[PDB]
């Protein structure tokens, strides 16, 4: 319902907009956590090669790495979606 | 036709399973006899659902009284419905 | 407010204090970013102050003692905005050079 919102991000503007659209579409289409994560990981694997990771949950802790400009953590209607590469 | 059971009038055959049955069919009157009285309300069903969640599967729902009757869909084979001295007991588990 | 602000402003003064950490960075930048990840937890342990000062300045805007309140709270969020901005810009230019 409400638009996405980044709590911590490291992406460019045009790349932020793409993940916004893909998240909106994933949540409208699928209804499961693994299905959403699988679909978004797949979308960004098609658009940006191999090595994407996407954590979709409600309360989790993470200690990760990534490529410097391929990390994002945003929330949609009480959904924590984290995404990064390598 | 509500056949008799060593605990109570149970709708024979029911839609549940006997560790749950025997447990409830002993635990309902065990609870009511030991230190409990009909004057108190759902502090009975409190201990009943607590005992069920302790040993058996965790998500139970209990409804008892003198006038009620339900349709619904639940976990397969998790339906206890028995009268005892003109008091209907109904219990069902939901995943 | 004072404590949390001294923390965030200390992070900023570590970003700005030595000509060394200004030009030649080190693993200390990883610790700065570590504190930046922590900054979530830091605001989590600071959030009792946001609602409490909200209740306070609801009927007590102050104006007399609110000096240090403004300093400290705005200094926190100042470190936050320079975090976003300087993180981006410094990353880019340190990549360039």
């Amino acid at each position: 319902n409400h638009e996405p919102e980044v709590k911590a991000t490291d992406m460019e503007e045009d790349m932020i907009k793409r993940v916004k659209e893909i998240a909106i579409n994933a949540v409208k289409e699928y209804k499961q956590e693994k299905q959403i994560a699988h679909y978004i990981k797949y979308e960004f694997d098609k658009i940006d090669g191999y090595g994407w990771n996407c954590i979709v949950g409600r309360n989790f802790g993470s200690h990760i790495i990534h490529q410097t400009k391929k990390y994002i953590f945003f929330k949609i209607n009480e959904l924590c979606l984290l995404l990064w590469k390598a | 036709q509500y056949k008799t059971f060593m605990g109570a009038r149970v709708l024979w055959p029911p839609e549940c399973a006997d560790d749950i049955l025997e447990g409830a069919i002993r635990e309902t009157q065990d609870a009511l006899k030991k230190f409990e009285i009909a004057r108190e309300g759902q502090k009975i069903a409190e201990h009943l659902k607590k005992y069920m969640d302790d040993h058996f599967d965790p998500y139970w729902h209990v409804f008892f009284g003198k006038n009620f009757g339900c349709q619904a869909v639940h976990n397969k084979n998790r339906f206890i419905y028995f009268y005892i001295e003109k008091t209907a007991f109904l219990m069902y588990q939901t995943q | 407010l004072d404590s949390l602000t001294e923390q965030t402003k200390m992070l900023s003064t570590k970003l700005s204090k030595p000509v060394k950490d200004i030009d030649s960075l080190g693993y200390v930048m990883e610790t700065l970013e570590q504190i930046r990840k922590e900054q979530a937890e830091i605001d989590m342990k600071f959030n009792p102050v946001q609602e409490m000062y909200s209740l306070l300045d609801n009927y007590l805007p102050g104006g007399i003692t609110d000096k240090d309140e403004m300093d400290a709270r705005s200094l926190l969020r100042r470190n936050w905005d320079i975090l976003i901005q300087q993180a981006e810009i410094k990353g880019k230019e340190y990549q360039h050079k």
Binding site: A37, N53, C54, V56, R58 | - | -
Partner: protein, 97 residues
């Protein structure tokens, strides 16, 4: 006999998970209060110590939580996620891929 539990997803050979179950149980009992930080730290420091668990692409990670979902590039060999019925802690263990 093992302590009761619910393996929601396991990938390693079953004796690895046996060891994980026993140590995680005795550890949840020895540290019944505090934060899941201490649980995670003690579990990593124990699991990383044994001569077993030889193979690792990245290194060890453990996450404790009560309500979440994730997706990782775990090493295709080792991965475990299960629950301790008395406390109901969804605990997760893997190696970075």
């Amino acid at each position: 006999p093992l302590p009761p539990h619910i393996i929601r997803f396991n990938d390693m050979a079953q004796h690895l998970l046996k060891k994980v179950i026993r140590q995680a149980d005795v550890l949840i009992k020895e540290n019944p209060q505090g934060l899941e930080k201490d649980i995670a730290l003690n579990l990593v420091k124990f699991v990383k110590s044994q001569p077993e668990f030889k193979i690792g692409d990245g290194e060890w990670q453990c996450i404790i939580g009560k309500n979440f979902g994730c997706s990782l590039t775990f090493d295709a060999n080792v991965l475990a996620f299960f629950d301790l019925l008395p406390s109901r802690k969804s605990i997760l263990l893997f190696k970075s891929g």
